Design a protein around this ligand. Structure first.
Ligand SMILES: *[C@@H]1O[C@H](CO)[C@@H](O[C@@H]2O[C@H](CO)[C@@H](O[C@@H]3O[C@H](CO[C@H]4O[C@H](CO[C@H]5O[C@H](CO)[C@@H](O)[C@H](O)[C@@H]5O)[C@@H](O)[C@H](O[C@H]5O[C@H](CO)[C@@H](O)[C@H](O)[C@@H]5O)[C@@H]4O)[C@@H](O)[C@H](O[C@H]4O[C@H](CO)[C@@H](O)[C@H](O)[C@@H]4O[C@H]4O[C@H](CO)[C@@H](O)[C@H](O)[C@@H]4O)[C@@H]3O)[C@H](O)[C@H]2NC(C)=O)[C@H](O)[C@H]1NC(C)=O
Ligand SMILES: CCCCCCCCCCCCCC(=O)O[C@H](COC(=O)CCCCCCCCCC[C@@H](C)CCCCCCCCCCCC(=O)O[C@H](COC(=O)CCCCCCCCCC)COP(=O)(O)OCC[N+](C)(C)C)COP(=O)(O)OCC[N+](C)(C)C
Ligand code: EGY
Ligand code: EGY
Ligand code: KZB
Ligand code: KZB
Ligand code: KZB
Ligand code: MG
Lengths: 53, 78, 422, 112
């Protein structure tokens, strides 16, 4: 049971949702958010789906 | 001036920081455990204040030094 | 004592987002006597570019260095130089004068489409603006590309492939002011660090860790219209004036570089350990096109022995005031903070150049009872030639650092005592 | 040497519980060991922002707080629209860790 729990924790449950794991990682989400932060007027309003709220 | 000043080498060779961190912690932890065991087993009529003070002081000293060397080992360099 | 400039060759280069002019002055003294030994040299600056100045250095024929101090006369912030050997009447001395002007190339269209090139304009002077009447002046202008559009003509300036020569002017007035303006193509990386904060924390236990926050903005030729990743990738022409990466040079003892942003780590960098330094190519999260103001954080820790000298009870450390960021940099605001340890009693700081300085304050990191002193120095308009070494001297009782372990101890002890009373 | 039954029993219980707690804390941090430590799954970013507010503005300003940066056409009152226990716990741990100078950013406290 100990070994099973360790394997399930290691290989399935630990994962990021901000970065797509492919070892090469492409963090397009963060780059887009940073651009939107630094290169829009201070009152710009962006609309998306409720997931990315 | 600046020519007659020696380079400031650390007082403890950094390669000795890991070896010193484990030992100082282990001993410390050991004593700590002892103290707590002593406080659960011993009744009111079988408690010596000097023994408790001695063991607690030893544990505190060793634990403080071990915690410092670990905190410095991770790289905080306090 | 009247001074005559004989030959003045002025080579200006405008390839960078900068204007560097090097004048090879040759000074002679007049035949009149009762002048003895002249020992002072006077330098002037035109009122157009007196505020956009970053550095003015003066050398001598061969390998040498000299000292200039700012002076006021009763106005263009005239400088004066102290010559090593005073020149008698009838002697001649060669003095090389190198100045650097920042924020002087203005983009003329001011709005460029994702598939166009930058056209900048420069407005300087024809003649050597000096308080002495010169004799033979020749100016050579170095450009970025061979796409000039309008250069003022005075003496039929011939044109080579990318360098423009101006006919030698036989004689000039006392103050020889004139307006010279070029409109050329400069598709080079324009980049301005708006505010860089350098924090240097010293620790007598191990090493010293320096971290710097960098706000940087692409100034010239702001972007109009839509940006398209497709055209940017599948067409190498489009995107000329943009920037993609820049390399920092680290002092060859850096050990823990991280390059974090304000929102998380950044996985786009490449560091190579060289024999004399540590090169680090950096890509921002996104390419810069016009006014895109990226902001990042770069920090590292190096061995203490390399930058810390201790004799008796005194310690003295010398480090670079402003460190390399990218080739031909420019800063608009720079704040140095040096975080000394707790027992820094007599703190003196030797500045290589005049640095504006604010009052000292206290910093409270982990094992601090009464805090630790920090030294803050504010400077503006820094260029690549402002990379010098600042040394601070302070006395520090060696026993005192022992208060950092003991502190921890006491806390532990308190807990045990609490148990006892319970 | 010989020990009493009570002493060996207490030592065994203490050792087992210490090992179990250390293992529980150790097993939790796999993601932190791999990728850099950042709040994830974009559900807790709201909690994270809220915790930062509580850590840099106070409680009385947090209890009655109106957020104009979300649901722009309407109004969202964060002070009374969510159960505040997690933010209070994090802010209390943060202030305790800051009284004794163990200064740690709000993000590291939220992560761990
Ligand atoms: C948190 O953030 C930090 C910081 O951002 C993250 O850290 C970063 O992680 C990346 C990993 O992607 C590290 O990258 C590495 O960079 C080094 C250095 O490479 C530079 O120098 C090379 C030297 O080239 C010499 O030789 C050539 C001729 O061959 C000459 O022409 C040169 O002049 C030099 O003399 C150079 O070749 C590199 O070029 C690359 O970049 C340019 C752009 O400038 C491109 O055009 C090129 O095509 C080329 O891509 C570069 O200039 C590299 O050496 C590392 O490569 C290793 O890993 C590669 C795969 O990732 C692999 O393909 C390489 O072969 C190399 O492999 C090495 O290691 C393997 C095992 O790992 C071995 O199997 C293998 O044999 C070999 O030994 C890598 O690219 C950053 O350095 C690092 N940054 C910092 C500050 O540490 C961190 O990851 C983040 N945390 C996360 C995400 O969790
Ligand atoms: C297994 C052996 C371990 C040996 C330990 C050695 C220490 C080594 C240190 C770790 C090394 C780390 C290596 C490292 O750092 O690598 C770096 C990378 O850096 C990192 O990122 C890693 C950083 C990780 C650092 C983490 C360090 C944290 C260490 C904490 C330590 C541990 C081990 C133990 C924690 C103890 C937890 C306490 C548990 C509480 C128990 C609850 C008690 C339950 C209870 O109530 O029982 C009752 C009885 O009552 C009691 O009496 C109990 C009171 C106990 C209270 C406390 C006692 C604990 C003592 C334990 C010994 C039972 O109730 P009952 O009696 O039954 O009730 C009945 C009552 N009546 C009704 C009366 C009968 C290397 O990276 P590098 O690359 O080198 O970076 C360096 C680079 N540079 C920066 C240098 C440049
Ligand atoms: C950044 C780093 C910060 C470091 C934080 C330091 C943490 C300090 C830990 C404090 C330890 C608590 C002390 C404690 O547990 O008290 C125990 C009572 O023991 C119990 O009954 C169970 C309590 C166990 C709780 C331990 C959780 C502590 C976790 C803190 C992080 C005393 O019980 P006793 O008094 O011994 O009961 C025996 C009574 N007889 C009459 C039978 C003798
Ligand atoms: C009860 C009252 C007291 C409450 C006490 C609360 C205890 C909080 C425990 C969390 C400790 C946080 C440690 C931590 O932040 O480590 C992380 C990531 O770095 C790591 O690798 C750490 C992972 C495992 C370390 C876990 C040690 C925690 C031990 C606590 C007992 C660092 O993240 P970064 O932000 O990346 O730091 C790097 C920045 N530099 C510039 C320095 C490089
Ligand atoms: C085991 C414990 C023993 C007590 C202590 O920790 C370890 O060791 C003390 C030092 O002696 C410190 C003083 C040094 C001179 C310094 C002069 C400044 O001027 C003044 O502002 C602060 C002052 C007096 C330091 C204050 C902190 C002290 C008392 C430290 C305590 C925390
Ligand atoms: C073990 C725990 C408890 C014991 C303690 O450390 C941690 O050890 C004390 C020190 O003596 C500290 C004082 C030193 C003199 C210093 C003078 C300044 O002037 C003043 O501003 C701060 C002051 C008084 C320090 C305050 C914290 C003290 C009391 C520390 C305690 C919190
Ligand atoms: C377990 C030990 C250590 C923890 C402690 O008891 C004994 O319990 C702490 C409390 O949480 C107190 C803080 C609450 C928040 C409050 C914020 C203000 O802002 C600030 O001024 C005071 C501050 C930080 C309180 C100071 C004393 C603390 C840390 C108390 C300690 C003595
Ligand atoms: Mg110290």
């Amino acid at each position: 049971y100990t070994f099973h729990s360790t394997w399930v924790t290691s290989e399935a449950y630990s994962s990021p949702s901000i970065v797509l794991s492919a070892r090469i990682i492409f963090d397009d989400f963060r780059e887009a958010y940073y651009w939107l932060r630094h290169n829009t007027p201070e009152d710009a309003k962006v609309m998306s789906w409720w997931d990315y709220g | 001036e600046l020519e007659a000043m020696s380079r400031y080498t650390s007082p403890v060779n950094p390669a000795v920081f890991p070896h010193l961190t484990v030992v100082l912690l282990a001993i410390g932890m050991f004593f700590t455990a002892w103290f707590f065991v002593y406080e659960v087993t011993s009744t009111k009529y079988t408690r010596d204040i000097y023994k408790e003070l001695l063991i607690s002081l030893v544990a505190s000293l060793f634990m403080g030094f071990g915690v410092l060397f670990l905190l410095l080992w991770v790289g905080i360099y306090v | 004592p009247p001074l005559i400039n004989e030959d003045v060759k002025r080579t200006v280069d405008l390839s960078s987002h900068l204007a560097k002019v090097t004048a090879e002055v040759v000074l002679a003294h007049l035949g009149g006597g009762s002048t003895s030994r002249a020992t002072s040299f006077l330098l002037a600056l035109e009122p157009e570019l007196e505020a956009r100045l970053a550095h003015l250095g003066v050398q001598v024929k061969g390998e040498d260095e000299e000292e200039n101090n700012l002076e006021v006369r009763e106005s263009g912030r005239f400088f004066t130089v102290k010559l090593p050997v005073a020149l008698d009447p009838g002697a001649k001395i060669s003095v090389i004068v190198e100045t650097v002007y920042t924020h002087v190339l203005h983009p003329y269209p001011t709005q460029i489409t994702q598939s166009e090139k930058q056209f900048v304009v420069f407005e300087g002077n024809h003649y050597f603006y000096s308080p002495y009447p010169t004799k033979t002046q020749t100016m050579r202008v170095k450009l970025a590309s061979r796409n000039v559009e309008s250069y003022t003509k005075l003496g039929n300036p011939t044109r080579s492939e990318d360098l423009l020569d101006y006919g030698p002017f036989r004689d000039v007035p006392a103050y020889s002011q004139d307006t010279f303006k070029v409109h050329y193509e400069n598709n080079s990386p324009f980049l301005t660090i708006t505010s860089m904060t350098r924090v240097i924390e010293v620790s007598h236990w191990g090493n010293i860790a320096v971290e710097e926050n960098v706000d940087l903005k692409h100034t010239g030729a702001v972007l109009k219209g839509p940006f398209s990743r497709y055209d940017y990738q599948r067409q190498p022409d489009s995107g000329i004036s943009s920037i993609r990466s820049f390399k920092t040079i680290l002092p060859a003892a850096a050990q823990d570089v991280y390059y974090r942003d304000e929102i998380g780590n950044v996985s786009t960098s490449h560091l190579l350990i060289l024999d004399d330094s540590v090169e680090m190519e950096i890509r921002p999260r996104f390419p810069l096109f016009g006014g895109w103001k990226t902001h990042y954080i770069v920090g590292y820790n190096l061995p203490s022995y390399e930058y810390l000298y201790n004799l008796g009870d005194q310690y003295a450390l010398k480090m670079r005031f402003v460190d390399h960021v990218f080739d031909e940099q420019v800063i608009d605001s720079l704040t140095v903070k040096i975080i000394l340890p707790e027992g820094a009693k007599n703190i003196e700081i030797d500045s290589p150049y005049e640095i504006s300085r604010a009052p000292d304050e206290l910093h409270y990191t982990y094992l601090d009872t009464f805090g630790r002193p920090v030294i803050v120095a504010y400077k503006k308009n820094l260029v690549e030639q402002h990379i010098q070494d600042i040394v601070v001297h302070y006395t520090f009782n060696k026993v005192l650092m022992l208060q950092e372990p003991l502190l921890v101890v006491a806390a532990f002890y308190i807990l045990f005592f609490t148990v006892i009373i319970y | 040497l010989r020990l009493s039954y009570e002493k060996q029993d207490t030592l065994l219980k203490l050792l087992i519980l210490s090992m179990a707690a250390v293992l529980s804390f150790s097993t939790r941090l796999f993601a932190v060991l791999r990728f850099e430590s950042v709040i994830h799954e974009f559900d807790p970013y709201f909690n994270y922002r809220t915790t930062r507010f509580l850590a840099e503005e106070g409680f009385y300003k947090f209890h009655n707080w109106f957020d104009d940066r979300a649901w722009y056409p309407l109004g969202r009152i964060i002070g009374g629209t969510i159960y505040p226990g997690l933010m209070i716990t994090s802010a209390a741990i943060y202030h305790v860790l800051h009284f004794f100078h163990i200064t740690i950013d709000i993000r590291n406290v939220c992560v761990f």
